[PDB]
Motif scaffolding. Structure first.
Motif, PDB file in Angstrom:
ATOM      1  N   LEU A   1      71.789  64.331  30.892  1.00 46.40           N
ATOM      2  CA  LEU A   1      71.712  65.338  31.938  1.00 46.40           C
ATOM      3  C   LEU A   1      71.541  66.704  31.292  1.00 46.40           C
ATOM      4  N   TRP A   2      70.644  67.512  31.850  1.00 46.39           N
ATOM      5  CA  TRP A   2      70.366  68.851  31.350  1.00 46.39           C
ATOM      6  C   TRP A   2      70.695  69.863  32.434  1.00 46.39           C
ATOM      7  N   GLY A   3      71.455  70.895  32.073  1.00 47.72           N
ATOM      8  CA  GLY A   3      71.816  71.962  32.989  1.00 47.72           C
ATOM      9  C   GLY A   3      71.152  73.264  32.572  1.00 47.72           C
ATOM     10  N   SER A   4      70.395  73.844  33.504  1.00 50.07           N
ATOM     11  CA  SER A   4      69.651  75.077  33.266  1.00 50.07           C
ATOM     12  C   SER A   4      70.215  76.175  34.159  1.00 50.07           C
ATOM     13  N   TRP A   5      70.874  77.151  33.538  1.00 54.06           N
ATOM     14  CA  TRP A   5      71.358  78.335  34.232  1.00 54.06           C
ATOM     15  C   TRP A   5      70.232  79.342  34.408  1.00 54.06           C
ATOM     16  N   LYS A   6      70.225  80.013  35.559  1.00 52.01           N
ATOM     17  CA  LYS A   6      69.321  81.123  35.831  1.00 52.01           C
ATOM     18  C   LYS A   6      70.148  82.335  36.235  1.00 52.01           C
ATOM     19  N   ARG A   7      69.846  83.485  35.635  1.00 52.56           N
ATOM     20  CA  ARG A   7      70.605  84.710  35.847  1.00 52.56           C
ATOM     21  C   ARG A   7      69.728  85.759  36.514  1.00 52.56           C
TER      22      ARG A   7
ATOM     23  N   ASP B   1      64.235  86.850  31.900  1.00 52.95           N
ATOM     24  CA  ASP B   1      65.412  86.221  31.315  1.00 52.95           C
ATOM     25  C   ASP B   1      65.228  84.708  31.305  1.00 52.95           C
ATOM     26  N   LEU B   2      65.154  84.131  30.113  1.00 53.07           N
ATOM     27  CA  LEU B   2      64.991  82.689  29.993  1.00 53.07           C
ATOM     28  C   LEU B   2      66.236  81.982  30.519  1.00 53.07           C
ATOM     29  N   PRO B   3      66.095  80.932  31.327  1.00 53.25           N
ATOM     30  CA  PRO B   3      67.278  80.169  31.736  1.00 53.25           C
ATOM     31  C   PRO B   3      67.934  79.499  30.538  1.00 53.25           C
ATOM     32  N   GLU B   4      69.259  79.383  30.595  1.00 50.04           N
ATOM     33  CA  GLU B   4      70.032  78.776  29.514  1.00 50.04           C
ATOM     34  C   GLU B   4      70.092  77.271  29.749  1.00 50.04           C
ATOM     35  N   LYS B   5      69.434  76.505  28.883  1.00 53.87           N
ATOM     36  CA  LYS B   5      69.346  75.057  29.023  1.00 53.87           C
ATOM     37  C   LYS B   5      70.285  74.402  28.016  1.00 53.87           C
ATOM     38  N   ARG B   6      71.263  73.649  28.518  1.00 57.01           N
ATOM     39  CA  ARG B   6      72.224  72.976  27.657  1.00 57.01           C
ATOM     40  C   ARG B   6      72.423  71.537  28.113  1.00 57.01           C
ATOM     41  N   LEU B   7      72.683  70.672  27.138  1.00 57.37           N
ATOM     42  CA  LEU B   7      72.974  69.275  27.418  1.00 57.37           C
ATOM     43  C   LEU B   7      74.347  69.137  28.060  1.00 57.37           C
TER      44      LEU B   7
END
Length: 103
Positions: A85-91, A97-103
């Motif tokens: 599962l990958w979680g992509s934050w958007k600010r 601003d690139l979204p922060e993509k973390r496992l």
């Protein structure tokens, strides 16, 4: 995970939203989950119970101001990648601003 807050673990929505109660109408647990998730998959921020946009401070009925007590944490977009599962934050609204993509 999509339906629940990323940090405090509380539901992103409460009885405040009429759509939430409309979903709550369902008796089958699976249908109720489907409806609640469909409503909550758009809420990208843990609502703190303070609707920003209504300037009318109604003091006659205080009963409509108790939020569930959210923390306001930004929520991610969850995607499936095989067994991961990958979680992509958007600010913010800025698109630089690139979204922060973390496992």
């Amino acid at each position: 995970l999509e339906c629940v807050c990323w940090n405090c673990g509380k539901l992103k929505i409460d009885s405040s939203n009429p759509k939430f109660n409309d979903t709550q109408r369902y008796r089958d647990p699976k249908n109720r989950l489907n409806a609640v998730w469909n409503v909550c998959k758009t809420k990208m921020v843990c609502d703190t119970g303070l609707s920003a946009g209504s300037d009318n401070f109604d003091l006659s009925n205080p009963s409509a101001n108790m939020g569930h007590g959210g923390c306001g944490a930004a929520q991610p977009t969850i995607r499936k990648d095989g067994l991961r599962l990958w979680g992509s934050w958007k600010r913010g609204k800025d698109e630089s601003d690139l979204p922060e993509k973390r496992l």
